[PDB]
Structures are given as structure tokens and as C-alpha cells.
Design a protein around this ligand. Structure first.
Ligand SMILES: CCn1cc(-n2c(C3CC3)c(Sc3cccc(C(=O)O)c3F)c3ccc(Cl)c(F)c32)cn1
Ligand SMILES: CC(=O)N[C@@H]1[C@@H](O)[C@H](O)[C@@H](CO)O[C@H]1O
Ligand SMILES: [Ca+2]
Ligand SMILES: [Zn+2]
Ligand SMILES: [Zn+2]
Length: 751
């Protein structure tokens, strides 16, 4: 066959991907990749006859045909560049006839650090306009690992990488007994690629996507010309979504570091390509008809060959393991059934050997929960977090790299929405990339497939929403037991002050009791034998007895803790904060008691005694909600009874894998936490309930030199705690639901 009259068609091959499969026709290049006389019109070419060899055209007939060089109108008919033009509000999608929807163009840039924007109008006048004139955020949080393949599919699917299955730029699938690599053919097999990506979510809903992926080898000018060509196609072929991908500024960034002087140029070059796009759209009357998302997959840190830890310095039988190196570590047995592979012995020998050590080993279950990086068969049990700026290798030409913890400033990236449906000159707070599938679905009138975004957490990005969020229905209503039993029946051995924003909704089927006291309020699980939440309010200037409301059948007992050689107990409401000593006895009710390992009590007690008081002076009062979390299967979802693998030796007292707190005050801190009229300020964590402090290499010193650091590492979104508990919080406030969602997606990094 031949590509004559077929270049960049929508289905021998002649579409944009045909190169990738080594299948484009003999004359693909000749006809489809035309490079003659460059990409800009110039004075000499106004008024020419059409010539077929040319790269793009500067004759009158080009405008209909769709294929003028993007500056033909500038150079030849007097018109200005888009960049040169004033910021004008787009209050309605000015589209041509038969455009059902404002089309959408996702413009990916690789390794685009959010700091690169500081550089600004000198280096990138076009991108700056998109930011200045549209809707932007100081930065966007990616996902971990901060690598390209995991981060691009998360934008496409709205899912965490453990969910969509692209868990790394490279992975071994123990069931497929095969491996996936950036460079290679294995990745082309769809079997690796779960969720429902945006191109599939649209096809199924009748909204046309086209051929969505380009072969990398095609240059960026040919790509954007072809995009403009397709937007003059008649209404039955025209796609309504498009995507463009620049492997820059990442390529240069690895070569020169992010703060390299040699970065100036690759970014101006990119802005070249963005301007061509707006110039091109303005000459097709489309520049006030299309929504354009300028977005990155990650940023970029400084990293040199000599900042490289070696496992062979820590381990003796190192030829026995396989290591996925770089800005993260993943370790598994090299050989099949090698009994001289002991994972316990690996973790132990990597733990705190060296004073200077620049990584930390985790069993994936023990990684902070915010990373949602465990529930996949291609995440090996042993994970090494690496310190920013450092590399881990196995055995003993670049200046930047990335892959680190996604809370890290250098790993943050950009987002700019600009078009008819995006707000005008609107700066919005940081958010996570997992929230972009839904928004992108809102921009095409698509119902989003099930995902990890919180639909409605981002409606303040847009001038009009096809989606109103609604609260979830309360599955189990509370009992309010009065006094019911006597202290003879036991064989052991508020809403104005303490529940400021309404009670959490229990979103699964069970029985539970609300219990009132002077200092706190609590919802108490009969199934789990402890509270699911304890709410209480410390103001700025601030023995275990039976609960006579709860059956002996449904209570815990001290005896169980005597049986268990390893387990102790702690209290959700901290006795240390009771208002009077009369009231202090309430804190020792068996219903405020929870099973804690001694190694954990050091962390818990420090938090309760020192930090809550602290945070209550700092933020003019706080309302804390604390409880337990069961996630034995590490899916990030609350556990059913049949999944709990640990009980307090002897009993039916289930052991939590984590404990959470949600800490809230008035954002306006001139008003105390309890007398607050406007928006909230929140901070949060989920701490792993482990029996050692082997995570904290400083654990040997006084709790002030290491606890608060441990907590900050396990900062978490309210939403994360909602997934883990099946509770729903902030259901009774003075604020609009979508603002509460935004509140509930907020992560307080400490950078
Ligand atoms: C199953 C849904 N799906 C996933 C892809 N997909 C692919 C193809 C399968 C390898 C790549 S990789 C790639 C693309 C384009 C060109 C080339 C090339 O070698 O020239 C290439 F290697 C990819 C990257 C990011 C995202 Cl978000 C995807 F959805 C990607 C296409 N569909
Ligand atoms: C932590 C969490 O909720 N993860 C969810 C996962 O459980 C779910 O299967 C997927 C599709 O909805 O989105 C993600
Ligand atoms: Ca679970
Ligand atoms: Zn990348
Ligand atoms: Zn890279």
C-alpha cells in the first residue's frame, strides 16, 4: 500500500503510531514527515503557489486545507501572535457550528519542576500567559514513585499506581513471569494496564478520541500541525480530546541538573511549541473554543554519581538479590527457591547500620499510608526509601534524577487549565494529580469510571460544573445507651464543645454506641470492642473502670493484656488533658482503652501529653478525632472481620495496624476552634502501630528528638483515613460541600 492521501488517518498503516509497530508504508516519511523550508512562514513566501514537498504552507488555500504554518497569518496577513494579545475573559465556548463540546488538548511535559515557572515570562512567555490568564496552582503533587510511566497512567486513569498496575518504569510480574521496561516491547502488551484510561472512558460514551498516542520519534512541530489539521475535520471524524507529550524538559534535566544554566534553552524551545499551538488555534478561530491543560508528570532533583549508597557494603550474600536501583529500592530474591534468601535478615541488616545512611528499608505494609504503594503483586515486599539527592545501587554522566517521595519539593510539578470552561485569572491551592481524570471527564461530559480522585474536590477550578457532589448515606445509625449494667456484672481484672462539625457517618453495617462525657465524645464499636473515633477539643489556655452503659459481653478486659506478653494499652482521649480530677476518671473507662505495644506508647504518649497542648497553643485550640485502623491486607480500605490477623492474646480484642488523629482548628486563628465562623484548617496523620521503633534511628534518645519527625513522615489526608475507616467526617459545618472535599483531600507536608 501507500500513504498517499492518508497521512495521520484515524484507524499497511499510516496513523501516528505506525512507526512504533514497524509498520508504516514505504512512503510514510516522504509524504507524512515533510521537512522542507522549516516550520515558520517568512516574508519571501507570502503569495506562493502550493508546493507538495513543503513542511507547512503559506499560500491562501492553506487555511481551509488546515495546514498553514502556524505563523502564516502573523507574517503574511499582519496578525499578531497569540502571546502578544491581551488577556480577555472567555465566558462562553466560542466554537464553530457542530462543535458539541469545547475540544480538549492535554499538553504533557516531562520532568517539569514547579519551580521552573519562577523563571517565567523571559524564558516561557506563552506558558506564562496560560498561567497568568487561566487557572493555575502553585504546584501539583504527583504520585509515588515520581517516575514517568506510573505518573502518566495516573493522569489517564485517576487511580493510584498499585491500582492501575503500572507501579514503576520497570517491574517484574511474578504471575506473568515477565518484566516490563521503558525501553522494550513488553510494555506494548495491554495486560499490564488496568483501570479505564481517559481515551477508553470516552470511546465507550460516544465522545471521539482519535488515534490518541503519537510515536515519540515524530518531531514536535509535525505533531502540533497534525493536531490542527484534525480540528478542521468534518463533525463525524473530528476527535474531541487530544494529547501532546514533550520528553523535555526531563531529557536535558538529567544531563544538567534542574538548576543548570543549560536548562534555559530546552524550556524556551518548549515554549516555542506552545506558542505555535495557540498561534495555530488562533488562525483556525479556535483559540477561545478549546480547553488546554498544561501539566507535568514530575519535577527533578540534583543527583550525581558520587551520592550512591551500596548494598554490598551492608550485606554479605549480595549476589543473591535483585535490586531495582536509583531514587528508590525494591529488592527480591534473584534465584527461585534459594533458602539462603532471608528477607527478615535483609531488612535487619539495612536498618540503621551507618550513621550517615541515605536510605531506609520498609516492608511495603509499613510505608507511610499516604503513598498508597503496597497493594500489588509487582511491589516487592522489601522497599527502600531513598533520601532526596541520593541514589542506592547494588554493587560499585547525569546531574538530575527523580523518583523520590512525592511530598518532596523538587518532585512537585505544574498544572495550568485554560479555556472556555476554566476559571479566569484564578489561582487555586495545590492538589494531587489523581484528581485530574474526573476534571478532564467533566470537560468532555463524561461519567468518570471508578477512581481515587474525589469528584467535586476541584470544582473551584471551573466556571461551570456538570457535577454537584452529595454526601454518602449513613448505613448504620447510632444507639445512645443510658445506664444499663452494674459494677457487679463486670469481671475486668459536649456537642457545643467537643463534636464541632457533626458526627462521622458509619458507612458499613454494624452496631455501635455514642457515649457522652465532660471532656470528650465517642462512637464505640461493639464488634471491635473499642471506639471507631474519639472527638475532643483542647482550648488554647488548657486504673481501668467498667463502662456502665456497655455490656460486659461487648467490653474489653485488663486480664487479656496480662496474657499477651507483647501488648500493653493506651487511651484515645488522653487522661493527661482532663479538665478536673473528678472528670479524669472518665478517661480510664474501659471504653476509652485501646491495645498499644510499649514501643508505640512512647509515641502516642508524647503526642498526647506534649504535642496536642502544643498545637492547641499554636493554632488557638484544636479538635482532635482519634481512632484505630485495621488494614491487614494493605489495600488501604477498612478491614472486614475475616481479615484481622491479630487479637490480644487470649481474647476477641482485635489489634489495629495503625492509629489516626484528625486535627482541626479555625483557619482564622483569631477565632478559637469552638467559636469559628469561616473555613477550617486541618492536619492529619496515620501512625503504624508497630512493636519496635526500628523506623526511628534516633529512638534511643528522648522523644522530643524523634517522635514529631516520625509523625510528620506519616502525614495523611482526611480522605485516606476515610478509606481506612469507612467513616465520613465534617458532615455538619457552615461550609459548602465541595469546599469540605478540598479540605478532605489536603495533605500537610512540612517543606
Ligand atoms: C492499555 C492502555 N494504553 C497504554 C498505552 N501506553 C503505551 C503503549 C503500550 C506501550 C505507552 S509507551 C509508548 C507510547 C507511544 C509511543 C511509544 C514508542 O515506543 O514509540 C511508546 F513506547 C504509554 C505511556 C504513557 C501512557 Cl499514560 C500510556 F497509556 C501508554 C497505550 N494504551
Ligand atoms: C485507597 C483506595 O480507595 N483505592 C481505590 C481502590 O480500592 C479502587 O478499587 C479503585 C477503583 O475505584 O480506586 C482506588
Ligand atoms: Ca483492608
Ligand atoms: Zn517523566
Ligand atoms: Zn526521567
Amino acid at each position: 500500500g501507500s500513504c498517499k492521501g492518508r497521512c495521520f488517518e484515524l484507524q499497511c498503516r499510516c496513523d501516528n503510531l505506525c512507526k512504533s509497530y514497524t509498520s508504516c508504508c514505504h512512503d510514510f516519511d516522504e509524504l507524512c514527515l515533510k521537512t522542507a523550508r522549516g516550520w515558520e512562514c517568512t516574508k519571501d513566501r507570502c503569495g506562493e503557489v502550493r508546493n507538495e514537498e513543503n513542511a507547512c504552507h503559506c499560500s491562501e488555500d492553506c487555511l481551509a486545507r488546515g495546514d498553514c504554518c502556524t505563523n502564516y497569518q502573523v507574517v503574511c496577513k499582519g496578525e499578531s501572535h497569540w502571546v502578544d494579545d491581551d488577556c480577555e475573559e472567555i465566558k462562553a465556548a466560542e466554537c464553530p457550528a457542530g462543535f458539541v463540546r469545547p475540544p480538549l488538548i492535554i499538553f504533557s511535559v516531562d520532568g517539569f519542576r514547579a519551580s521552573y515557572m519562577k523563571k517565567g515570562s523571559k524564558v516561557m512567555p506563552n506558558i506564562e500567559k496560560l498561567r497568568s490568564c487561566g487557572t493555575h496552582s502553585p504546584y501539583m503533587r504527583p504520585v509515588y514513585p515520581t517516575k514517568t510511566f506510573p505518573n502518566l497512567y495516573t493522569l489517564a486513569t485517576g487511580l493510584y499506581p498499585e491500582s492501575h498496575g503500572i507501579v514503576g518504569n520497570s517491574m517484574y510480574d511474578p504471575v506473568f513471569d515477565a518484566t516490563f521496561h521503558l525501553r522494550g516491547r513488553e510494555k506494548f502488551n495491554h495486560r499490564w494496564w488496568g483501570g479505564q484510561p481517559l481515551w477508553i472512558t470516552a470511546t465507550k460514551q460516544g465522545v471521539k478520541a482519535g488515534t490518541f498516542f503519537w510515536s515519540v520519534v515524530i518531531p514536535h512541530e509535525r505533531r502540533i500541525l497534525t493536531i490542527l489539521q484534525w480540528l478542521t475535520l468534518p463533525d463525524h471524524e473530528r476527535p474531541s480530546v487530544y494529547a501532546f507529550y514533550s520528553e523535555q524538559p526531563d531529557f536535558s534535566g538529567h544531563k544538567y541538573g534542574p538548576f543548570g544554566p543549560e536548562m534555559t534553552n530546552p524550556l524556551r524551545e518548549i515554549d516555542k511549541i506552545v506558542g505555535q499551538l495557540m498561534d495555530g488555534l488562533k488562525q483556525l478561530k479556535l483559540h477561545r473554543c478549546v480547553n488546554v491543560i498544561f501539566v507535568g508528570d514530575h519535577g527533578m532533583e540534583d543527583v550525581t554519581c558520587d551520592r550512591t549508597e551500596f548494598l554490598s557494603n551492608y550485606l554479605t550474600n549480595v549476589d543473591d538479590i535483585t535490586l531495582v536501583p536509583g531514587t528508590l529500592g525494591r529488592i527480591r530474591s534473584k534465584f527461585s527457591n534459594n533458602a539462603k534468601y532471608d528477607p527478615k535478615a535483609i531488612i535487619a541488616a539495612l536498618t540503621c547500620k551507618k550513621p550517615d545512611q541515605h536510605f531506609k528499608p520498609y516492608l511495603k505494609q509499613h510505608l507511610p499510608k499516604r503513598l498508597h504503594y503496597a497493594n500489588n503483586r509487582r511491589i516487592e515486599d522489601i522497599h527502600l526509601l531513598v533520601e532526596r539527592r541520593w541514589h542506592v545501587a547494588r554493587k560499585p554522566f547525569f546531574q538530575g534524577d527523580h523518583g523520590f517521595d512525592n511530598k518532596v519539593n523538587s518532585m512537585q510539578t505544574v498544572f495550568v487549565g485554560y479555556g472556555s470552561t476554566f476559571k479566569y485569572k484564578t489561582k487555586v491551592p495545590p492538589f494531587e494529580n489523581i484528581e485530574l481524570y474526573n476534571v478532564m471527564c467533566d470537560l468532555l461530559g463524561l461519567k468518570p469510571a471508578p477512581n481515587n480522585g474525589t469528584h467535586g474536590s476541584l470544582n473551584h477550578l471551573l466556571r461551570t460544573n456538570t457535577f454537584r457532589p452529595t454526601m454518602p448515606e449513613e448505613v448504620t445509625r447510632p444507639n445512645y445507651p443510658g445506664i444499663m449494667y452494674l459494677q457487679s456484672d463486670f469481671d475486668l481484672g459536649t456537642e457545643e464543645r467537643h463534636l464541632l462539625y457533626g458526627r462521622p457517618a458509619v458507612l458499613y453495617r454494624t452496631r455501635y454506641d455514642i457515649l457522652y462525657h465532660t471532656d470528650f465524645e465517642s462512637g464505640y464499636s461493639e464488634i471491635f470492642l473499642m471506639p471507631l473515633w474519639t472527638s475532643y477539643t483542647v482550648s488554647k489556655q488548657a486504673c481501668v473502670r467498667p463502662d456502665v452503659r456497655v455490656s460486659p459481653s461487648f467490653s474489653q478486659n485488663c486480664l487479656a493484656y496480662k496474657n499477651d506478653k507483647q501488648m500493653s494499652y493506651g487511651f484515645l482521649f488522653p487522661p493527661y488533658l482532663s479538665s478536673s480530677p473528678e472528670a479524669k476518671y472518665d478517661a480510664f473507662l474501659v471504653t476509652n482503652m485501646v491495645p498499644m505495644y510499649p514501643a508505640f506508647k512512647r509515641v502516642w504518649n508524647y503526642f498526647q501529653r506534649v504535642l496536642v497542648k502544643k498545637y492547641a497553643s499554636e493554632r488557638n485550640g484544636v479538635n482532635v478525632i482519634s481512632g484505630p485502623i485495621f488494614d491487614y491486607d494493605y489495600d488501604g480500605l477498612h478491614d472486614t472481620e475475616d481479615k484481622i490477623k491479630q487479637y490480644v492474646e487470649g481474647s476477641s480484642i482485635p489489634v489495629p495496624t495503625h492509629y489516626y488523629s484528625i486535627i482541626t482548628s479555625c483557619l482564622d486563628f483569631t477565632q478559637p476552634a469552638d467559636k469559628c465562623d469561616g473555613p477550617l484548617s486541618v492536619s492529619s496523620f496515620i501512625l503504624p502501630h508497630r512493636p519496635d521503633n526500628e523506623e526511628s534511628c534516633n529512638s534511643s534518645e528522648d522523644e522530643s528528638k524523634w517522635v514529631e519527625e516520625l509523625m510528620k513522615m506519616h502525614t495523611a489526608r482526611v480522605r485516606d483515613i476515610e478509606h481506612l475507616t469507612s467513616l465520613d467526617f465534617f458532615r455538619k459545618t457552615s461550609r459548602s460541600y465541595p469546599e469540605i472535599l478540598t479540605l478532605k483531600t489536603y495533605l500537610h507536608t512540612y517543606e
